[PDB]
Structure formats: structure tokens, C-alpha cells
Amino acid sequence: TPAITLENPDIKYPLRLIDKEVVNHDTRRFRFALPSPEHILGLPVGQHIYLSARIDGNLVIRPYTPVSSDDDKGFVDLVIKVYFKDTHPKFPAGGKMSQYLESMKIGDTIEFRGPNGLLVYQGKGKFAIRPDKKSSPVIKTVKSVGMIAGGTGITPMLQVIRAIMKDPDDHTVCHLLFANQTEKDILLRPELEELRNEHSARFKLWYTVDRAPEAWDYSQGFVNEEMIRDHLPPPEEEPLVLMCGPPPMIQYACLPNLERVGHPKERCFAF
Numbered sequence: 001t002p003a004i005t006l007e008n009p010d011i012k013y014p015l016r017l018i019d020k021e022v023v024n025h026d027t028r029r030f031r032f033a034l035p036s037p038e039h040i041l042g043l044p045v046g047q048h049i050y051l052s053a054r055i056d057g058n059l060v061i062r063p064y065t066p067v068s069s070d071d072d073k074g075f076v077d078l079v080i081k082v083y084f085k086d087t088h089p090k091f092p093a094g095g096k097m098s099q100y101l102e103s104m105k106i107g108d109t110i111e112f113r114g115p116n117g118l119l120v121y122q123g124k125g126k127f128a129i130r131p132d133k134k135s136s137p138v139i140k141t142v143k144s145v146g147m148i149a150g151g152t153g154i155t156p157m158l159q160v161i162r163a164i165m166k167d168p169d170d171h172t173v174c175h176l177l178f179a180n181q182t183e184k185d186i187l188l189r190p191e192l193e194e195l196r197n198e199h200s201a202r203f204k205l206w207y208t209v210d211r212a213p214e215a216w217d218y219s220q221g222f223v224n225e226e227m228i229r230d231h232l233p234p235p236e237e238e239p240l241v242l243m244c245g246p247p248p249m250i251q252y253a254c255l256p257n258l259e260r261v262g263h264p265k266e267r268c269f270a271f
């Protein structure tokens with residue numbers, strides 16, 4: 001195969017920032033060069049990496065979930081929300097690592113390590129999911145996958161969605177319910193709607209926003225029972241249900257409603 005970058009998850013690999021694209025008012029795509037144009041990252045689908053730096057005198061380590069893949073030679077793409085200082089009353093300092101990343105210039109480097117995570121998508125509906133960090137993966141193959149994402153929680157979902165759509169012999173149907181604070185907060189909307197336009201048989205797309213615009217054809221509010229019932233595959237079809245977002249989204253909006261609708265805990269996984 002191509003040369004792999006992440007050869008051991010405990011080793012740090014400094015990668016250079018080569019491009020940055022505005023995703024919306026607070027979110028960006030950060031592209032980093034791999035060690036050569038022929039390297040691949042070494043990233044089983046569904047896993048994340050960790051960035052680390054000394055910021056204002058403290059060690060700061062944070063995970064980010066690449067949206068690129070091992071088909072992408074020579075680079076890795078992260079999609080990262082910046083939490084700005086002097087904005088939210090409860091968090092006047094903003095976020096440490098995200099603001100550090102926002103301040104990086106092209107050519108600056110930061111240390112990557114990985115890959116990590118309990119889920120690996122192995123293609124053609126096959127997921128290898130470890131119950132925890134010390135157990136063997138359980139291999140679950142499904143015809144359909146429900147996905148509930150909030151904000152930057154879209155990133156592992158997009159890894160999985162992209163992997164599926166690339167394989168014309170992968171017949172897995174993804175049902176995404178994507179929640180954000182407002183319409184302008186819907187990350188990577190053109191990418192998602194391009195996926196829907198081109199793969200409608202394998203990709204079902206629905207949004208909810210905390211605060212809805214005048215003309216709105218999707219849902220409004222936190223994730224609820226109705227949304228899960230109408231925009232994820234029914235429990236009878238035994239889909240896997242993947243979730244990723246703010247901890248209270250998982251705890252209060254997803255889990256109780258998945259239970260109400262009838263999706264068993266065994267079929268549910270939170271990134």
C-alpha cells in the first residue's frame with residue numbers, strides 16, 4: 001500500500017498547515033500536508049486523531065475527526081469549530097485549542113497522533129465496534145444506519161457517509177438527522193445536499209435547527225421523538241443508530257427518544 005503516516009498511536013507526527021477554508025462564521029476546514037504527497041494518514045473509517053500543543057503554559061490535547069480518508073494521498077482535512085473569546089457569557093475565555101488553530105499561519109505545524117476510537121467501518125454495511133477500550137470488536141453488519149449529529153458531531157458521520165457512497169457495491173442506506181443552532185450553522189450544507197442529489201437511494205437527509213428561519217421545510221427545536229421516528233429507519237429494520245454531538249444532546253434528546261421509538265441499546269453507538 002502507500003506509505004502510512006500514523007504508524008503507532010503513541011508517536012507524535014508534526015504536520016504542516018497548508019490550507020484553510022471558511023465553512024461558516026465559526027467553523028473552518030483545516031488541511032494539513034502528510035509527510036509526502038504519496039503518504040496516506042492511516043485511518044480506519046470512523047476513527048479520530050488527537051492534536052496536541054503547549055498553549056499558554058499548559059498541555060492541551062484534543063481529538064478531531066478527519067473528514068478525509070486513506071484514498072486522499074498527501075493530506076488530511078479536519079473540520080473544526082472555533083470557540084471565540086469574548087462571545088459567550090458563560091465562556092468568556094473561548095476555547096483553548098480551537099483558537100490556537102485559528103491563529104495558525106500557513107506553514108505552521110502541530111503534532112498529530114492516532115488513530116483512535118471504538119468504531120471502525122469495514123465497508124459493505126460491516127461495522128467493527130468494541131464495547132470498550134479493553135475488549136474485542138463485535139462485528140455488526142446492517143442494511144441501514146441511522147445517524148444523529150449535532151454541530152461538529154457531523155464529522156464522524158461524514159467519514160462514514162463518504163466511505164459508503166464511494167463504493168457502488170455498498171448498498172448501505174444512511175439516514176442522517178443533523179441538528180444545529182440556526183440555518184447558518186448547518187455545517188457543510190452544500191456537500192450534504194450534493195450527496196443527497198447524487199445518492200438519494202442510499203442517503204436520506206433531514207435537518208433540525210434550534211431557531212428556524214421564515215421559510216423552513218425541515219424541523220425546528222432539539223432532537224425529539226417525532227424526528228427520530230420519521231427520519232431514522234424503524235426499529236423493525238434493525239438499523240445501527242450512531243450519535244455524535246454535545247453530551248446533553250446525547251443524554252437528553254437522543255437516548256430517551258430512541259427508547260420511546262423502540263431502538264434497543266445494543267443497536268446504538270455514541271462516538
Ligand SMILES: Cc1cc2nc3c(=O)[nH]c(=O)nc-3n(C[C@H](O)[C@H](O)[C@H](O)COP(=O)(O)OP(=O)(O)OC[C@H]3O[C@@H](n4cnc5c(N)ncnc54)[C@H](O)[C@@H]3O)c2cc1C
Nearest residue numbers: 063064065080081083084088091094095096097098152155
Ligand atoms: C472523539 C472526539 C472527536 C472530536 N472531533 C471534533 C471535530 O472533528 N471537530 C470539532 O470542531 N470538534 C471535535 N471534538 C471537540 C474537540 O475535541 C474540542 O473539544 C473542541 O475543539 C473544543 O476544544 P477547545 O480547546 O477549543 O475548548 P476548551 O478550552 O477545552 O473548552 C471550551 C468549552 O467551552 C465552551 N465554549 C468556549 N467558548 C465558547 C463559545 N465562544 N461559544 C460557545 N461555547 C464555547 C465549549 O463547550 C467549549 O468546548 C471532538 C471531541 C471528541 C471527544
Ligand SMILES: NC(=O)c1ccc[n+]([C@@H]2O[C@H](COP(=O)([O-])OP(=O)(O)OC[C@H]3O[C@@H](n4cnc5c(N)ncnc54)[C@H](O)[C@@H]3O)[C@@H](O)[C@H]2O)c1
Nearest residue numbers: 150151152153179180181210222245246247248249253271
Ligand atoms: N465524540 C466524538 O467523536 C465527537 C466528534 C465531533 C464532535 N463532538 C462533540 O460534538 C459537540 C459539538 O458542539 P457544537 O458547538 O458544534 O454544538 P452546538 O452547541 O452548536 O449545538 C448543536 C446542536 O446540538 C444540540 N444541543 C446542544 N445543546 C443541547 C442540549 N443542552 N440539549 C439537547 N440538545 C442540545 C442542538 O440540537 C444543537 O443545535 C461537542 O460537544 C463536541 O465535543 C464529538
